[PDB]
């Protein structure tokens, strides 16, 4: 359409879980000596806006998801292993 109308913009931006591509080191910050492939993963996380400085968008339901990641210890060995990550399923704007 020519323009995204106001209520559609509001609905699409308002606090909800959204696919976010997150660096594996952000979730496993002490595993910085490994190289991972891929180096980031797609995780549903609360995002968007609550449009009121009195409120933050925060999770109310979370789940864990396991993904196969190539974990490389350089000059040592490598393998695809399972890594667990936290996702968000439901969010709300809270004080």
């Amino acid at each position: 359409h020519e323009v995204v109308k106001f209520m559609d913009v509001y609905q699409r931006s308002y606090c909800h879980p959204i696919e976010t591509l997150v660096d594996i080191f952000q979730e496993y910050p002490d595993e910085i000596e490994y190289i991972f492939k891929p180096s980031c993963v797609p995780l549903m996380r609360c995002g968007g806006c609550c449009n009121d400085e009195g409120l933050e968008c925060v999770p109310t339901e979370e789940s864990n998801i396991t993904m196969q990641i190539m974990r490389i210890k350089p000059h040592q060995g490598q393998h695809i292993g399972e890594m667990s990550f936290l996702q968000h399923n439901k969010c709300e704007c809270r004080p």
Partner: protein, 89 residues
């Protein structure tokens, strides 16, 4: 409650207002439609009220959040320049 509603009556001073909008969780939503939000009451219909809220225009209402949170704006908000209004939060 989504759709266009036209204002029949509300417990507010329109004053110079042309742009009515906000994001609200109503206390009540009975039957026309009365809405109660703290307190403010307002009644609305799918039908018009000649020459009384006419500057404010129809009220467009949509539900927000993924499965009683509504956002709304008045037709008078649809101006190329800023106009007197309020944002009800």
């Amino acid at each position: 409650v989504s759709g266009t509603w036209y204002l029949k009556a509300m417990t507010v001073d329109v004053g110079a207002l042309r742009c009515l909008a906000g994001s609200v969780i109503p206390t009540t939503l009975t039957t026309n439609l009365e809405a109660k939000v703290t307190e403010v009451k307002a009644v609305l219909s799918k039908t018009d009220e000649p020459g009384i809220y006419t500057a404010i225009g129809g009220i467009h209402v949509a539900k927000i959040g993924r499965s009683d949170h509504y956002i709304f704006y008045s037709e008078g908000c649809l101006s190329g320049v800023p106009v007197p209004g309020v944002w009800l939060v």
